[PDB]
Amino acid sequence: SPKLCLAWQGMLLLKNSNFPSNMHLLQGDLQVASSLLVEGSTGGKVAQLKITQRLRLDQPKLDEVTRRIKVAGPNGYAILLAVPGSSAASDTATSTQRPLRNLVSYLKQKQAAGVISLPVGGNKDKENTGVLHAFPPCEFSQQFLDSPAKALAKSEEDYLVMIIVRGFGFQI
Amino acid sequence: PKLCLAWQGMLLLKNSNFPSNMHLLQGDLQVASSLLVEGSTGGKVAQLKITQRLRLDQPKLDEVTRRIKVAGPNGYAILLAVPGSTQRPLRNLVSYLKQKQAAGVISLPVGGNKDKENTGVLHAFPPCEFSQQFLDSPAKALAKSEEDYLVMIIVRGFGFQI
């Protein structure tokens, strides 16, 4: 049964919009999430995660998401459920706050997963980095939702499934 | 992180069992882990039996609040029970306790203990103004409807736990 630990709270960013979100652990290694959802240089907490790329939801991409989880192994991935969270001129990054449903609807219509490189700011060694793929509700993402998970996921318009994979190849 | 699953099993009332998952809201996880056991062995228990009730009146609720406070930070744990010898959905237990206007009472550990400091009491509250105070916004999302959860308040021992 999914642990549902509150692994992260903050804003997802896409260009000039931000979306408050709470992320709950569904499966995999909580430590994979806690070690990558950070500022890369310090390991410190980050309040924003920026979607910088899109992955198409075509079957060949989905099959590679599945394969990279299996390659990484039980200590090399985490899957989270992202649900809506709780709702200056010199700021180099401006953004309109929007409900998570906006981002969900966008990714559903674009038929894409959002890509977030981790940790924030990167790292020179390929093996201490990772990637989060943010999937909208769809047949692929529903396979990771058991009955207690769906209760959190109120509607097919209000959640994302976040798949974090650490490193390159098998994780030990 | 808050909200991790801390116990999975059946809540027992009379001749019915209600599968429940308990997630940590507040307090000391170790209070729950050490008391949600079979006393004679310290091992995992799959069932917890409600054997008493406490009415939801104001002087009793004020005293629950006081007992949480006096226990200290290692003396209590608060958990959210969500749906997880006839099996019934948890909402039937919720409806029953809502109708009776009472909290269920479970003595811990299962089987008791001769030393008070190694025992606890779990009060299982239905949704109400009092129990809602323990749910922040992230927790409210797990709670779903006002018919589908209980708030489990575990207090260890007697007075401040030190």
Side-chain angles (χ1 to χ4, degrees), chain A, chain B residues 1 3-65 67-162:
Chain A
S1 195
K3 282 214 82 203
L4 300 183
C5 291
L6 190 54
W8 194 81
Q9 287 187 283
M11 278 162 308
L12 298 177
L13 305 189
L14 181 64
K15 302 134 172 123
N16 298 306
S17 290
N18 67 266
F19 318 87
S21 197
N22 296 334
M23 293 185 8
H24 297 263
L25 181 66
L26 292 175
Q27 65 164 281
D29 193 342
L30 178 64
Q31 168 78 252
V32 170
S34 66
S35 71
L36 286 172
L37 295 177
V38 297
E39 172 187 52
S41 64
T42 64
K45 162 134 145 33
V46 295
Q48 297 162 24
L49 296 172
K50 183 164 179 175
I51 296 170
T52 55
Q53 211 174 233
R54 294 172 297 269
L55 179 76
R56 300 180 50 90
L57 297 181
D58 299 346
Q59 198 58 47
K61 289 93 177 62
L62 301 179
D63 288 348
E64 180 66 0
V65 170
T66 293
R67 173 193 92 80
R68 292 204 184 179
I69 292 171
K70 294 181 194 298
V71 166
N75 302 117
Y77 82 105
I79 302 182
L80 315 173
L81 183 68
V83 295
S86 59
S87 303
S90 47
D91 289 10
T92 53
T94 192
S95 168
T96 296
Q97 180 177 113
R98 304 185 192 269
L100 184 64
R101 179 185 38 141
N102 175 303
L103 178 58
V104 172
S105 300
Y106 175 70
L107 293 175
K108 275 174 100 163
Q109 285 186 231
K110 180 66 171 176
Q111 281 299 290
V115 181
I116 307 178
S117 63
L118 297 173
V120 179
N123 190 288
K124 256 58 173 180
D125 313 295
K126 164 60 193 176
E127 70 165 356
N128 321 331
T129 66
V131 64
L132 183 156
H133 286 111
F135 294 88
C138 58
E139 163 176 56
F140 173 81
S141 61
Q142 285 147 24
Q143 80 180 281
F144 306 107
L145 296 186
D146 76 336
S147 33
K150 323 190 163 293
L152 242 185
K154 283 292 191 158
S155 40
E156 301 305 296
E157 288 72 32
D158 284 277
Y159 67 89
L160 300 174
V161 171
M162 316 303 245
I163 302 186
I164 301 176
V165 171
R166 181 169 171 110
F168 187 100
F170 178 70
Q171 287 309 274
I172 190 175
Chain B
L3 303 183
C4 327
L5 182 65
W7 187 87
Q8 261 186 300
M10 301 288 187
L11 298 179
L12 254 292
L13 186 62
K14 316 278 235 283
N15 295 332
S16 299
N17 67 284
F18 312 88
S20 325
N21 292 345
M22 291 207 172
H23 297 260
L24 184 64
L25 294 174
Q26 198 185 317
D28 184 355
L29 177 59
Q30 201 39 240
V31 169
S33 305
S34 67
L35 287 175
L36 291 174
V37 300
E38 163 59 59
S40 57
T41 76
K44 191 95 226 173
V45 284
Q47 318 159 21
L48 296 169
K49 191 166 145 193
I50 298 171
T51 56
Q52 289 176 302
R53 277 201 290 270
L54 176 73
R55 303 169 181 110
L56 304 175
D57 83 25
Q58 198 54 46
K60 285 168 197 38
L61 296 179
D62 294 347
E63 177 63 5
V64 170
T65 295
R67 291 194 184 187
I68 292 168
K69 169 70 164 223
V70 303
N74 308 105
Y76 81 101
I78 306 182
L79 304 104
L80 182 65
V82 301
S85 49
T86 310
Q87 189 192 279
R88 312 241 191 251
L90 181 61
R91 88 193 317 300
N92 291 19
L93 179 57
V94 175
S95 299
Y96 182 89
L97 295 175
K98 282 182 91 184
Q99 180 258 107
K100 298 298 193 211
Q101 279 303 279
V105 179
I106 304 175
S107 286
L108 299 179
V110 182
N113 193 285
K114 279 156 184 36
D115 291 329
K116 183 64 175 183
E117 70 267 20
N118 292 331
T119 68
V121 175
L122 185 159
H123 284 108
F125 288 86
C128 59
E129 187 164 35
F130 175 82
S131 61
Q132 287 166 348
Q133 84 189 87
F134 299 102
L135 310 173
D136 66 2
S137 298
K140 283 152 191 139
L142 266 77
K144 184 175 37 163
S145 99
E146 301 311 316
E147 304 272 65
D148 292 301
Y149 70 90
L150 299 174
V151 172
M152 320 300 264
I153 303 183
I154 304 177
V155 176
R156 180 178 182 102
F158 182 97
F160 195 104
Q161 297 299 288
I162 189 174

